[PDB]
């Protein structure tokens, strides 16, 4: 009975250590996974922000351009009406 | 009035390439799945060691 | 004493198996979570890249347009000055 | 000089809808939390099986 | 022998509880990690969608503007040719 | 024909700041790593309790 119990214990222990090992592997995988996510975020932030900045700058430029064009057209019509 | 200055900055796109990371995630998710299968085995094994004295 | 130990062991084992089961559920959840992230990334990459491409193409188009407009205005002024 | 060709491609936006995934993540994060509570219980239960012979 | 086994068991149990505690900490960390991801997604979705919307609207506006400019130029040339 | 209406909405960019979240992820990933080291220790400790009767 005592040897039986001892054998059971040993078997349980081996299996338990193996189980914990597997869980440790999983934890390792998760660690890696989160770090990857962290890296991806950096990349997205940068591209996204760059795009936003460009878009903003683009609209400012466009506003300037269109304003100039409007002025030009007005002047052209003035000249035409004087003609 | 003369010709207006109409400058326009060309935007040169930097493409987001996430395929490696993808991928790496995919690999992790399947490794975790495989861990679940092995852990189910080991759990039933621990259950088999219950004594009947 | 031996029966007591045996009973303790059995109790421990049941609880241990339950604990491992819970951890397994957690691992499953994590697996699912990472896959979801992987899918999301694909989506973001695509939308973001599409937007970037469009923006780039848009600026090229705009440059062409403004160049043409400048030329046109120059010609108009030439005609006006000839008038 | 004539009228200039001023073509401009209309951009038709594809909207990023991440609410399902969101969400799915949210669900996973709370399932993992609930697991922590159950695991705390089970751990104290394993601790109760220490023998005093 | 029985006391020895009992001592082994107790030692195993303590260590096992500690191990489960560590795994629980890891699970907690993972939970937090996924929630953070969930939050980040919301942010990205919004910025990205906003940018896309603006870009779309911008092109519509640009199309209108260029159409008007084309019409204007045509009229200007008509006037010039009449001159 | 008169001067054309050439309206253009200025886009005011909202910048994506993910550094806190980053970061928070980074912190989680290293906490999980440290857990792996401690768990390796505890596993070898459980292995040391095998009886030889």
Numbering used by the authors:
A (entry chain A), C (entry chain A), E (entry chain A): 1059 to 1141
B (entry chain B), D (entry chain B), F (entry chain B): 1324 to 1376
The article reads:
Virus entry of CoV is mediated by its spike (S) protein, where its S1 domain facilitates attachment to host cells, and its S2 domain is involved in the subsequent fusion between the virus and host membrane. During the fusion process, two heptad repeats, HR1 and HR2, in the S2 domain, assemble into a six-helix membrane fusion structure termed the fusion core. The formation of a six-helix bundle (6-HB) fusion core brings the virus closer to the cell membrane and promotes membrane fusion and infection. In this study, we have determined the fusion core structures of CCoV-HuPn-2018 and SADS-CoV at 2.10 Å and 2.59 Å, respectively, thus further completing the structural profiles of α-HCoVs fusion cores.
CCoV-HuPn-2018 is the human isolate of canine CoV (CCoV), which was isolated from Malaysian patients with pneumonia, experiencing a respiratory illness. Likewise, HR1 (residues 1059–1141) and HR2 (residues 1326–1376) regions of CCoV-HuPn-2018 S were constructed. HR1 of CCoV-HuPn-2018 forms a 23-turn α-helix, while HR2 adopts mixed conformations: residues T1342-T1372 fold into a nine-turn α-helix while residues V1326-L1341 and L1373-L1376 on either side of the helix adopt an extended conformation. Then, three HR2 helices pack in an oblique, left-handed and antiparallel direction into hydrophobic grooves on the surface of this trimeric coiled coil, forming in a six-helical bundle structure with dimensions of ~116 Å in length and 30 Å in diameter with a left-handed supercoil. To compensate for their longer HR1 regions, the HR2 region of CCoV-HuPn-2018 also contains a 14-residue insertion that folds to a longer HR2 helix. Besides the nine-turn helix, between the N-terminal Val-1326 and Leu-1341, plus from the C-terminal Thr-1372 to Leu-1376, HR2 has an extended conformation, contacting HR1 residues 1101–1134 and 1059–1068, respectively. Among them, filled by the side chains of Leu-1339 and Leu-1341, could be a potential pocket for small molecule inhibitor targeting. On the contrary, in the helical region of CCoV-HuPn-2018, residues on HR2 mainly engage residues on HR1 through side-chain to side-chain interactions via not only hydrogen bonds but also salt bridges. Overall, the fusion core structure of CcoV-HuPn-2018 is very similar to other Alphacoronaviruses, such as HcoV-229E and HcoV-NL63. And the superimposition of the two structures of CCoV-HuPn-2018 and HCoV-229E revealed an RMSD of ~0.477 Å for 83 Cα atoms of HR1.
